[PDB]
Amino acid sequence: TLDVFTKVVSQADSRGEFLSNEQLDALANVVKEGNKRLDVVNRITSNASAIVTNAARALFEEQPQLIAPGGNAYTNRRMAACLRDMEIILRYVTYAILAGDASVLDDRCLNGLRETYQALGTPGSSVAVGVQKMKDAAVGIANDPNGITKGDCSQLISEVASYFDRAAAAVG
């Protein structure tokens, strides 16, 4: 479990020198964008369950053979395995957005997902499609201004689109 701060700390520990001035200048900018980071993380967990069901219907339409009998997500028991585990991507993504680093995302939700499926028979491609259907809706939920002050989050929202793309490409 690493931060943006402890990323710089463990990197400066390996060289064994003091923290340089521009690194403190860069981390002072993270303090200024710190309140925008709580704007984006609070907006996802408020719309957490609404974006799980909405990405599930768009997945199970466009691959109809899953629900269909013989499919990997056919019975009501596996179906809940898949439907509820779509939160576990979002559980570890919004950890990484609030952390600002992809270390927590890597060793919990990324380290064995492409591992565990060969023994399970869950298609790798199907899982990737589902997370990529979360990404265009999770970015779109945090994008629109309604009752918040207007600011610029382009350089910060691209971190969120990188986090889902890190989660997608490591499996499929």
Partner: protein, 284 residues
Amino acid sequence: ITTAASRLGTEPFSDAPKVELRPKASREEVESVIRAVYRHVLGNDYILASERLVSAESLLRDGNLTVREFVRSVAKSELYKKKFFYNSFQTRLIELNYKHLLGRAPYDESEVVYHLDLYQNKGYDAEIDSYIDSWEYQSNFGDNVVPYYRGFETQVGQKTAGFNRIFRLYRGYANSDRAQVEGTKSRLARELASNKASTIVGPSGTNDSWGFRASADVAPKKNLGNAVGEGDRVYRLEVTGIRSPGYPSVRRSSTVFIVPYERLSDKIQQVHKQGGKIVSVTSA
């Protein structure tokens, strides 16, 4: 897990009733709790009648004793050490006590580091006290409930790298865990600090080839080269047992192949001609 549980051999654990200890005493339910303790803690080894620990049992009949204090007392007993502690490495044991007392394979290497400095300062008899007096034990096992395998379900808060270290631990219901061909050495001491999760291999007959351990200096899982193939799809296929032409042709059986897409179809045909069996191909 069902139709993967038939292959992996974890269908008996998937629908396994909790034994408990309802507070009314009855000899039969107590007799069936005691088999449920010694089967999981001793890894389906058999207990003969001198090996029964009949004096352990007398306390169990009384109300004060709790399966939890009993499981402390079987692991501190010199019987359990004669099978597992003397004929094994200390890291293996730290890895092993999580399999019996907690039921899950070790998550991080840092959990392991804490145990060694506890084991040195306070002994092994206080180490097993720290496995039992854990919050993860008390949350899923009560005082009157036997430890069972929790490797399979979600047990929220698990890492999935530990989902596959559990399949490196026991090879089926049928196994002893002294009866795996790496028996003495820690199978996961390399995996815990390389921090990679190796390939799930299932047991025998359900899977045609059970004979795959991860090598020392083996091919990397994700690769960079296009590998001659015109279109980038590259797949990583490993073979388990090769008994093809001898001394110079096969210097090393169980070698991992990295083959791109367009020659994958001919590649499976060469491996079967070698008499080898494939445990895994993986896109990277």
